[PDB]
Write an enzyme that holds these catalytic residues in place. Structure first.
Site, mmCIF file in Angstrom:
data_model
loop_
_atom_site.group_PDB
_atom_site.id
_atom_site.type_symbol
_atom_site.label_atom_id
_atom_site.label_comp_id
_atom_site.label_asym_id
_atom_site.label_seq_id
_atom_site.Cartn_x
_atom_site.Cartn_y
_atom_site.Cartn_z
ATOM 1 N N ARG A 15 -3.096 13.653 -14.230
ATOM 2 C CA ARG A 15 -3.352 13.574 -15.662
ATOM 3 C C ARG A 15 -4.630 14.291 -16.055
ATOM 4 N NH1 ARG A 15 -5.024 9.162 -13.147
ATOM 5 N NH2 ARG A 15 -7.090 8.315 -13.672
ATOM 6 N N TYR A 16 -5.423 14.700 -15.069
ATOM 7 C CA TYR A 16 -6.730 15.278 -15.314
ATOM 8 C C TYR A 16 -6.629 16.709 -15.815
ATOM 9 C CZ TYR A 16 -7.887 11.225 -12.449
ATOM 10 O OH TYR A 16 -7.992 9.954 -11.937
ATOM 11 N N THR A 17 -5.476 17.345 -15.652
ATOM 12 C CA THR A 17 -5.277 18.648 -16.252
ATOM 13 C C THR A 17 -5.068 18.503 -17.752
ATOM 14 O OG1 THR A 17 -2.894 18.585 -15.879
ATOM 15 C CG2 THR A 17 -4.266 19.507 -14.135
#
Lengths: 128, 128
Positions: A15-17
């Protein structure tokens, strides 16, 4: 976010993208408000979804296919934007085109990276 | 004369979603009805393949108020399905009467007047 290259890259940061809608997607999927495409209900019986989409180009030719062998896999090569546009114009203006006409408006399939394709009759048998 | 069966139906309505899907919603049932045995009979009617359209057989939050919901796909004629409910299912009730009285041991049968008449003369003797 992290996505790597054709390197052997593993971006575990899920989810960090960051991402959202893209520029081609904007005009690529208009006209939902015009009852153009049919819909089916989900298994959740609450919201709908379309089985097909409206198009502004045959992405069939723009992005290829790398299938799996459920009966057999499939390679489909990518092509060029404006060459596809010229092919559309060619088939529009003439219902009597040939394969040499396809050789004109498509000199050859292309890549986001680049290679060399020396053969000719393999390309001929590919498009026929 | 206290004899005969009469017809009884459940408070049952068709309700539309935010999607336009319809819902059979019952509130209660007539006398001597189980939720669960009729629910098993619904699951029968699913696997008996003698009724169509039906998708969801659900029941929740029932302790603040009784809420059992059948939910049916579109293009199904849900009111005809309600007709099929109160024809074949046990939701329809043929409730019969039998009031065959006993007055001082011997069996009798009374009208609604005579009951209250014996009540009157009993109150006479009571207050006297």
């Amino acid at each position: 976010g992290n996505f790597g290259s054709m390197d052997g890259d593993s971006a575990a940061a899920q989810r960090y993208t960051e991402a959202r809608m893209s520029k081609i997607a904007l005009e690529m999927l208009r006209d939902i408000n015009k009852n153009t495409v049919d819909f089916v209900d989900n298994y959740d019986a609450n919201e709908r979804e379309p089985l097909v989409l409206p198009a502004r180009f045959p992405n069939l030719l723009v992005n290829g296919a790398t299938g799996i062998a459920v009966g057999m896999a499939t390679n489909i090569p990518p092509h060029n934007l404006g060459e596809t546009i010229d092919a559309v114009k060619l088939v529009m203006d003439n219902p009597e085109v040939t394969t040499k006409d396809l050789m004109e408006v498509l000199p050859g399939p292309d890549f986001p990276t680049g290679a060399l394709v020396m053969g000719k009759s393999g390309i001929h048998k590919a498009y026929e | 004369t206290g004899k005969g069966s009469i017809v009884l139906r459940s408070r049952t309505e068709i309700e539309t979603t935010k999607t336009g899907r319809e819902r059979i919603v019952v509130t209660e049932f007539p006398y001597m009805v189980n939720k669960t045995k009729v629910h098993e009979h619904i699951v029968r009617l699913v696997q008996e393949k003698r009724i169509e359209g039906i998708t969801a057989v659900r029941d929740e939050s029932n302790r603040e108020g009784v809420r059992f919901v059948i939910e049916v796909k579109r293009d199904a004629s849900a009111n005809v399905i309600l007709n099929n409910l109160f024809k074949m299912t046990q939701m329809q009730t043929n409730f019969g009467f039998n009031m065959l009285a006993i007055q001082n041991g011997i069996p009798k049968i009374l009208s609604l007047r005579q009951i209250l008449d014996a009540y009157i003369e009993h109150q006479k003797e009571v207050v006297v």
